[PDB]
Design an enzyme around this catalytic site. Structure first.
Site: not given
Ligand code: CL
Ligand code: CL
Length: 162
Positions: A11, A20, A32, A104, A117, A132
């Site tokens: 990040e 972002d 965010l 996250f 998955s 996948n």
């Protein structure tokens, strides 16, 4: 390496409101703020989050505080989620970090949607799961980060982060 160092690498850290990869107003370590296009709606959320008039700028400490809350909430959201909890319980410590990282970034609902998955991970079919996981908008939009997470799930080591 642990979840904190891992997400810090994925990040980055920015002390001023930024946009972002999706074009949303964010600050700090991937926090965010809003999906709204208004910079003012963002500054408002920012000040509400910090408890002071920030004029869109925060300190390192403030950023780390937000980050501590966000990881904590990510874990707790996994534990409260009926689809996620069983996967997390089944995983070893490194792979758990990989799932927390997806949550996250994309939220609980987003991850919980990777039905196939998740099933492969629970069954410990590493190579199949990696294949996948790559067939997703996620992988297509942020390929470098997705590859790092996927490699973590495939191998169960921190190699992609070293
Ligand atoms: Cl918050
Ligand atoms: Cl990327």
């Amino acid at each position: 390496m642990n979840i904190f160092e891992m997400l810090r690498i994925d990040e980055g850290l920015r002390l001023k409101i930024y946009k972002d990869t999706e074009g949303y107003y964010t600050i700090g370590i991937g926090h965010l703020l809003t999906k709204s296009p208004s910079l003012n709606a963002a500054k408002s959320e920012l000040d509400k989050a910090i408890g002071r008039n920030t004029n869109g700028v925060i300190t390192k400490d403030e950023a780390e505080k937000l980050f501590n809350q966000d990881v904590d909430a990510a874990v707790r959201g996994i534990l409260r989620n009926a689809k996620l909890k069983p996967v997390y319980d089944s995983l070893d410590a490194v792979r758990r970090a990989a799932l927390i990282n997806m949550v996250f970034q994309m939220g609980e609902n987003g991850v919980a949607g990777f039905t196939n998955s998740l099933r492969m991970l629970q069954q410990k079919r590493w190579d199949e799961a990696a294949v996948n996981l790559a067939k997703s908008r996620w992988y297509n939009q942020t390929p470098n980060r997705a590859k790092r997470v996927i490699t973590t799930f495939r191998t169960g080591t921190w190699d992609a982060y070293k």
